Design a protein around this ligand. Sequence first.
Ligand SMILES: Nc1nc2c(ncn2[C@@H]2O[C@H](COP(=O)(O)OP(=O)(O)OP(=O)(O)O)[C@@H](O)[C@H]2O)c(=O)[nH]1
Ligand SMILES: Nc1ncnc2c1ncn2[C@@H]1O[C@H](COP(=O)(O)OP(=O)(O)CP(=O)(O)O)[C@@H](O)[C@H]1O
Ligand SMILES: Nc1nc2c(ncn2[C@@H]2O[C@H](COP(=O)(O)OP(=O)(O)O)[C@@H](O)[C@H]2O)c(=O)[nH]1
Ligand SMILES: [Ca+2]
Ligand SMILES: [Ca+2]
Ligand SMILES: [Ca+2]
Ligand SMILES: [Mg+2]
Ligand SMILES: [Mg+2]
Ligand SMILES: [Mg+2]
Lengths: 53, 425, 437, 334
Amino acid sequence: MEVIELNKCTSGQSFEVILKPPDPSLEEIQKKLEAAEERRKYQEAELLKHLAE
Amino acid sequence: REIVHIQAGQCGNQIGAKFWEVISDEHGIDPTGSYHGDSDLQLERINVYYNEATGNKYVPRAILVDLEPGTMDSVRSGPFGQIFRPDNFVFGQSGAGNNWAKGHYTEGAELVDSVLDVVRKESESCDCLQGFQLTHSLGGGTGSGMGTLLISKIREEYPDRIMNTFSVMPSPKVSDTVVEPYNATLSVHQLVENTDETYCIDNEALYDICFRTLKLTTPTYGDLNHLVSATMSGVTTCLRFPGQLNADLRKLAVNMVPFPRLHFFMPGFAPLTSRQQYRALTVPELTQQMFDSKNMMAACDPRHGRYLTVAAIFRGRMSMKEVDEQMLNVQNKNSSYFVEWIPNNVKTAVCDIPPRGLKMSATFIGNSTAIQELFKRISEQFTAMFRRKAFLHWYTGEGMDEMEFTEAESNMNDLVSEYQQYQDA
Amino acid sequence: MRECISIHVGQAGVQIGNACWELYCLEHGIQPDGQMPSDKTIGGGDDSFNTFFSETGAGKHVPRAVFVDLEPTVIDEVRTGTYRQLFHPEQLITGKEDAANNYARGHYTIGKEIIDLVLDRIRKLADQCTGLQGFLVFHSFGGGTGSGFTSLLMERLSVDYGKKSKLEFSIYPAPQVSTAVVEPYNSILTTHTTLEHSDCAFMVDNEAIYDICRRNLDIERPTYTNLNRLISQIVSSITASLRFDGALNVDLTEFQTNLVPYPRIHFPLATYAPVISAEKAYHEQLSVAEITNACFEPANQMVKCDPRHGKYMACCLLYRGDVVPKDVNAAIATIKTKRSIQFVDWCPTGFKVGINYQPPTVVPGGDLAKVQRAVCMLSNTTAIAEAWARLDHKFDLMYAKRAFVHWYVGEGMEEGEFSEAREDMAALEKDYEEVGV
Amino acid sequence: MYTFVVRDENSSVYAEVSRLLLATGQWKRLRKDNPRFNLMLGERNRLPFGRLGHEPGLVQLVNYYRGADKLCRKASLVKLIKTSPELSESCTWFPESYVIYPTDEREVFLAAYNRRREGREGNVWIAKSILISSEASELLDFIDHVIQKYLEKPLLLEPGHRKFDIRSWVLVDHLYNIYLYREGVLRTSSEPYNSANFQDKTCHLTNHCIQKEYSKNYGRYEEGNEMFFEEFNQYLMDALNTTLENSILLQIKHIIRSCLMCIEPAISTKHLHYQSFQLFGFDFMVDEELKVWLIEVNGAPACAQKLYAELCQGIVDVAISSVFPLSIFIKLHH
Ligand SMILES: Nc1nc2c(ncn2[C@@H]2O[C@H](COP(=O)(O)OP(=O)(O)OP(=O)(O)O)[C@@H](O)[C@H]2O)c(=O)[nH]1
Ligand SMILES: Nc1ncnc2c1ncn2[C@@H]1O[C@H](COP(=O)(O)OP(=O)(O)CP(=O)(O)O)[C@@H](O)[C@H]1O
Ligand SMILES: Nc1nc2c(ncn2[C@@H]2O[C@H](COP(=O)(O)OP(=O)(O)O)[C@@H](O)[C@H]2O)c(=O)[nH]1
Ligand SMILES: [Ca+2]
Ligand SMILES: [Ca+2]
Ligand SMILES: [Ca+2]
Ligand SMILES: [Mg+2]
Ligand SMILES: [Mg+2]
Ligand SMILES: [Mg+2]
């Protein structure tokens, strides 16, 4: 039961008790966002082609 | 999030008219378009189905379509006939003769562009259109043949919008002509491809409910449309009133449709009481009847298949706590009838505003694999005639070939087998 | 003084945000118009509450917050709410149609079209900061916006604010209030994409909050309002050290230092006590030992799980009210000799304690009774992996049949992203295994 | 209508339990992967405790205590008795044991073995996780586990001069009440105990498998080498002039309480979101001084053929019906 690092202020206090010792770049993100948009556009064009038949 | 409503053919316009009569009463709208309600819950989502024109009047966002003026004349002279926008009456004169080819390929093709002009005008005024709902039968010619032609062209012009239908399925017990299985089979394939949600309303089930349960000795079409009107009000409650679950057409589809083609729902309603009507129901009674086959509108036995998804909507002032435990009671008591590979597939919603004439009601929306019994029934009736090419000349006379019938037959058999795949998995 | 910006995404994020900022104003004595009588420096400040509030020349204290939702119905409630004067229009961002409980719709389809607007509005608040230290992001796991758009924002925040810390307050899905069957899909998808971009994340299971509201508050059918006022108490006790004078968890960096030794294991468990129904006219005021003991009762945890069958990597005790260190030490000593508190070997068995003398503030007319002392325990225990197991199991059931997958592929997402996300969660569960067993 | 699932098909005890539940008309068995159950008869290994207690409107009960493995494994039991102050390393009813890894206590086991050789005391030890030897070298070489003192002077049942161990069944319910089954059994050896030749482990190991495979007199003095309590109580009265209750059962009830109370704070489901119960199998040995020793605890025991019906019905009444309503037990108060 060792109490360490006791800091006291008017608002309260804090301390520690011890009981025992022991990213994608902007380009890579834009690439993935536009790839998904192209797959959406491709699926929509195939539907319009199917409806044109 | 506006919905554009379309009603096509005799059945679609007669059922569509009753639907607008019922929900206009619930939202406090009179036949002149004026509001006379006592709660703001009636107006909070009124714009989903109504346009507000000048003078603080509400005009339904509804388009009335037919190849014959007869039924739509009756609508214009009906109770709420004056509430409909006069320009939204689009009709021809020749009729469709209960012929899918006439609705889809010849007579209907001549009229469809004028309907799409009205659809376009109603859509241009929507702040953010979310989709369309169509009411029609599958056994006739205009609603079935021209309705599915309409759905195809609407999808082409609005590919990113939700398409929802209330589709009345024919039955030899309530039949007008012998070609209804032909018309139903041709249009079911259209619905498989071009709608996101379809409420399967079987006229046999409506007849049996009117006769066996409601004790109506001689059911009329008006009696059948009473049930449909009450069912349509229930299944659209979550769209018309404030709520958290299935509040729009796309979230409903996401919750109800685990596979794109399997979007054919069994609707149900409770209470269904013969005329007693004054007896108050309890939440356990509402929940038991709502899941009972005798309250289903598709004439399929749910115990012959499994539930993929279920939407439940309780209306009225009731114990929300007791609602939750009764819903859990149903699932935990008969858990073999729900697929285990979709956890928590039963979603419940509660609305405080009850339907007219009732203090409490429950509406059932189920995506059950037992709906394959409906498509199998139509398929047997189709094959019994098509095997002898009987009555085909009505269709080949309009330019169709036998091959298109063979393909429609194979498509609906494929759909039946697709339901069989997920009933055992 | 270093500022913090709060971001609220989706319905859950926005509604919880409105409950927290209401509570912050009550705690700091900020009137609904934005005035703060106890603030003698008008038009500017350099003290602790200025980390969450900017100041106008007219003395208005403005939250450093941005609200974003793809549907305007929830944010419009903020525009007309009690604290409408606090926010200016640039802080509130709405779309026309939502993500429809679809991660791919929120991340790819709608996220791509609105991500630049959100970042621009965040840049405006960031440009008002003298030394911005990072972001607190409130969102749900199950919603299409809360899951899909949040992961896109966290990516762009790591890009545009590489040195800043990012903390999450995340709502784990519970079928008792859940609005979608695909919420397990969205939860795992957004955890896979956000994991590398979040330094510390506090998960809140709606199931746990639901039952605490039923048992401790005697609410038969808890609403989002009941849940959010309770969640706001927890979040307030977690952020209190950033908004008040003190020495524990004084900046966002110390949250990772004190609670997250291993970067991927950054989901501390929160436990709060006491929760007393305001409908009770009188209640026996619990002692320091009694509220500290309740921190090890699973019925008080934000995620129902069993810390006895895991291992602790860190443990913080955050007290509010009439508490002195002597009673805390005596409470901890007696608890060690009655409970299973096993730490990993490469960490010291101990507790970091923070005490704020001001008792917790309750919303007047709320469900929570004012108490003389309260505590929130933040413990990084491997037992929280039980929540990942439940979630991954539900994912496996639906995905084995590809149920609902077409909704995601239809928005441009590849089906392989499902498998990448599930494999990442599988590695995550293994990490908790080799640390806690 | 309560619901339950079965996830351990090779369990003879709970196969009868589930059969009894179905025979009440108020229980329905679901598919093993259906989560909407009231009762789980779970698998032995890797029971998913973390998925229990998360089903709205379902009180969920499981037939295993998470964490009870600390008591039902040889190595963990020795660690538990040494480390826990409630049991302590000076525990008198448990044989001197040491955990040997092939932390490791190989230097302490030799320190005690050398201490025994210094005093010319009985230096026979047994290893298991089996080799009985009088030299520490032969034991450590065989491992490359736990080595404990072999009871060189056990109580020998006459006629036969033979060895025996006592199996006690214990049921702990969701309230952590400890119920001791009134009907125990004695797995007797049918071969005379022989202090010479400890490798002939037919008279030295009372396992029903070994006695049914190598013992010549298997089924002579008692069927299946299983003597019930009534006959054994009569023997102690005729031979030793005492009763089973005084000479043995008091020590048995004492050991069961000490073991289960020691782990109660670690495994109790008192305020947990799901409830647990579990059937245990305690194995005891008796020496010639009528002192009882604890051998091991089994987490998934199998009953005796005669008692397979009484105990399983007792499990339904005490552990299952107490949670889901529709004495053969000795309640050990604590
Ligand atoms: N605790 C709490 N949970 C909420 C709240 N609102 C929604 N949720 C939960 O969040 C999940 C749904 O996510 P939402 O935030 O509503 O959805 P969204 O982020 O707006 O995304 P979309 O509506 O699909 O565009 C469900 O599990 C709800 O139970 C809230 O106010 N408080
Ligand atoms: N320390 C000891 N002294 C004397 N005999 C012992 C002993 N340890 C074990 N034995 C004998 O060896 C037998 C088996 O011991 P062990 O503890 O390995 O049981 P086990 O796990 O092999 C089968 P079970 O599941 O029935 O307990 C005991 O029945 C006992 O007769
Ligand atoms: N439920 C119901 N079904 C109808 C109604 N009118 C016609 N039907 C059914 O619809 C089919 C006939 O199609 P119909 O709509 O009359 O022809 P259409 O004008 O060409 O679309 C048959 O199956 C009839 O049983 C009605 O008012 N209510
Ligand atoms: Ca013509
Ligand atoms: Ca100031
Ligand atoms: Ca980073
Ligand atoms: Mg007709
Ligand atoms: Mg939303
Ligand atoms: Mg054993």
